[PDB]
Amino acid sequence: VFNATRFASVYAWNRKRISNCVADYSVLYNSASFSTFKCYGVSPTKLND
Amino acid sequence: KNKCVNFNFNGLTGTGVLTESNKKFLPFQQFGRDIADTTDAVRDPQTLE
Amino acid sequence: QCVNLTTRTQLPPAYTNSFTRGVYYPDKVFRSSVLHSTQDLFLPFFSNVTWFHAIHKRFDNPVLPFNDGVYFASTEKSNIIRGWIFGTTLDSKTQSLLIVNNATNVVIKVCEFQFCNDPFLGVYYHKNNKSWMESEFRVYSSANNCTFEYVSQPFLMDLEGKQGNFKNLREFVFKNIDGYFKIYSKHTPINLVRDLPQGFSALEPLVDLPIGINITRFQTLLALSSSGWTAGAAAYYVGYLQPRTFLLKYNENGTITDAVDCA
Amino acid sequence: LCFTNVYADSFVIRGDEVRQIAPGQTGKIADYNYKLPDDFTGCVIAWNSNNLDSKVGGNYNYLYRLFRKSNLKPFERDISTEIYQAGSTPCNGVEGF
Ligand SMILES: *[C@@H]1O[C@H](CO)[C@@H](O[C@@H]2O[C@H](CO)[C@@H](O[C@H]3O[C@H](CO)[C@@H](O)[C@H](O)[C@@H]3O)[C@H](O)[C@H]2NC(C)=O)[C@H](O)[C@H]1NC(C)=O
Ligand SMILES: *[C@@H]1O[C@H](CO)[C@@H](O[C@@H]2O[C@H](CO)[C@@H](O)[C@H](O)[C@H]2NC(C)=O)[C@H](O)[C@H]1NC(C)=O
Ligand SMILES: *[C@@H]1O[C@H](CO)[C@@H](O[C@@H]2O[C@H](CO)[C@@H](O)[C@H](O)[C@H]2NC(C)=O)[C@H](O)[C@H]1NC(C)=O
Numbered sequence A: 001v002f003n004a005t006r007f008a009s010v011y012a013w014n015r016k017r018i019s020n021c022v023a024d025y026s027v028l029y030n031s032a033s034f035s036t037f038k039c040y041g042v043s044p045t046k047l048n049d
Numbered sequence B: 001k002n003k004c005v006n007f008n009f010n011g012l013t014g015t016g017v018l019t020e021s022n023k024k025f026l027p028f029q030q031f032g033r034d035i036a037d038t039t040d041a042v043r044d045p046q047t048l049e
Numbered sequence C: 001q002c003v004n005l006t007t008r009t010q011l012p013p014a015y016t017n018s019f020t021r022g023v024y025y026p027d028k029v030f031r032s033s034v035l036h037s038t039q040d041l042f043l044p045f046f047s048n049v050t051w052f053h054a055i056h057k058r059f060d061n062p063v064l065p066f067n068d069g070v071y072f073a074s075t076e077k078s079n080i081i082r083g084w085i086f087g088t089t090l091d092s093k094t095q096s097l098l099i100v101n102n103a104t105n106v107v108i109k110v111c112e113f114q115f116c117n118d119p120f121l122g123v124y125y126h127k128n129n130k131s132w133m134e135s136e137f138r139v140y141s142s143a144n145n146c147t148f149e150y151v152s153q154p155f156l157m158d159l160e161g162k163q164g165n166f167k168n169l170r171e172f173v174f175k176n177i178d179g180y181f182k183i184y185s186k187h188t189p190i191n192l193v194r195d196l197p198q199g200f201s202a203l204e205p206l207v208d209l210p211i212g213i214n215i216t217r218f219q220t221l222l223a224l225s226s227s228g229w230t231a232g233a234a235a236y237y238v239g240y241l242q243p244r245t246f247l248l249k250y251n252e253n254g255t256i257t258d259a260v261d262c263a
Numbered sequence D: 001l002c003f004t005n006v007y008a009d010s011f012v013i014r015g016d017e018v019r020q021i022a023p024g025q026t027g028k029i030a031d032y033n034y035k036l037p038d039d040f041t042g043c044v045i046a047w048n049s050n051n052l053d054s055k056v057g058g059n060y061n062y063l064y065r066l067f068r069k070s071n072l073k074p075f076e077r078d079i080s081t082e083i084y085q086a087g088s089t090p091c092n093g094v095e096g097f
């Protein structure tokens, strides 16, 4: 998701199904460096629980 | 004292008549609060009365 | 220094009753002639305050849990209880808080201490001088990474006395909430022999330390060739605070004069 | 307005991570080295310091914690440098797989 060599154009934006996986978002701390990360249906603290 | 004034003690803005009290605040206390929880007494911060 | 003083008799764990103690002023607001309900980490009424002795024979300084705050009290004579150690490893893998009252001044310091298995202070008793003076300080070996440090203005507090019944009760509440370590304390004279006096008196706040360390265990520091000594006639009691509603009576002068434990 | 007890917490972070300084946030700054309480009463102040702190060869005097067994508590400061175990094995000494 966050490392794909080539992203899609915004008019042709891609959609990928994520299923049967563990959402351990900690793994990308070392290398993500997100300028924006905003949640709208949850508090960000709760994502692990 | 004894006149109606718009007071401000440590930012504690309000309107009321100031009067000399006989309440004995232990030093760690600056404000006293009513049954209604409205601040009813204050320790003047320049002349500690 | 750092020495193990292993000469001591083995006794089982004692307990006693916290009748109506461990109540403190819940905030710095004044209130008089009112009954005030508040929910906070209080010492539950009539709970078991674990009980420890220093005798002659017995010198009890265990490392104890520190969870949801602690109530600490010491029926003290001849100034035997002198401080505490707080932390979660007490081995310099992590930081720890040291509070010590020594003969010259009170010192509060937070460092990566390397504490001894048996920390203590010591006094030379009647060594041809008529007065008593402190000589031994054996709690930690080195204190490198310090991030908080306070030392009070100097004094001389006497370390001599042999009267039978305890003449001082010192009470403390310790809470470590969101990086602020809060201490409430009270002092009352007593004339009791061997138990936590029955009665009621609320602790005023005195100091709030922004140490910001993780505290899971704590240990009190008592005054005391390397092995074989005599312990002072002093006893201290430890309870634990739980989140409980307390109704508090304020008298006409604003001091909490009575309280009721809602549970 | 007057203030009763005032503490200034001073530190340097990557510009992307200023958003993590708000109370109730996640990320390796909020999670592992600096957490603000949910009822935080105060103000957050930050300014771009590239002209002061940056070094042509790279200024490495500014450190952040990348691994932690658990998210730290508000206003908690973890100085520990002990090695973090990612796998199920224990790891002693200085380094390992
Ligand atoms: C504040 O310090 C606490 C004490 O060190 C610490 O709790 C400790 O957490 C670790 C890891 O969760 C525990 O280590 C053991 O955990 C279980 C048993 O509880 C075992 O399966 C593991 O293999 C490991 O041996 C400690 O037992 C635990 N200590 C206590 C007294 O509960 C807190 O996590 C610290 N707080 C923060 C925010 O870091
Ligand atoms: C605040 O300032 C006042 C002076 O501006 C201090 O009060 C003075 O105290 C002396 C000694 O009692 C009096 O002679 C002066 O008349 C007082 N000043 C006024 C304006 O009445 C006061 O001490 C200061 N606050 C504190 C906490 O020291
Ligand atoms: C006091 O006794 C404790 C044990 O009760 C000693 O701690 C041991 O120290 C050795 C290294 O010197 C370690 O290998 C052991 O694992 C430790 N045991 C425990 C239970 O911690 C301590 O060294 C002694 N101190 C003195 C000054 O004799």
Ligand SMILES: *[C@@H]1O[C@H](CO)[C@@H](O[C@@H]2O[C@H](CO)[C@@H](O)[C@H](O)[C@H]2NC(C)=O)[C@H](O)[C@H]1NC(C)=O
Binding pocket: C144, C145, D079
């Ligand atoms: C915690 O203590 C260690 C050990 O002294 C400190 O590591 C030293 O840091 C200084 C300053 O950069 C170096 O000159 C030394 O070479 C380091 N010693 C070792 C053995 O690595 C560390 O900096 C301390 N941490 C804090 C936050 O004070």
Ligand SMILES: *[C@@H]1O[C@H](CO)[C@@H](O)[C@H](O)[C@H]1NC(C)=O
Binding pocket: C124, C127, C128, C129
């Ligand atoms: C007696 O006091 C003096 C200083 O007043 C001190 O130097 C000396 O060591 C003391 N003697 C003993 C036995 O402690």
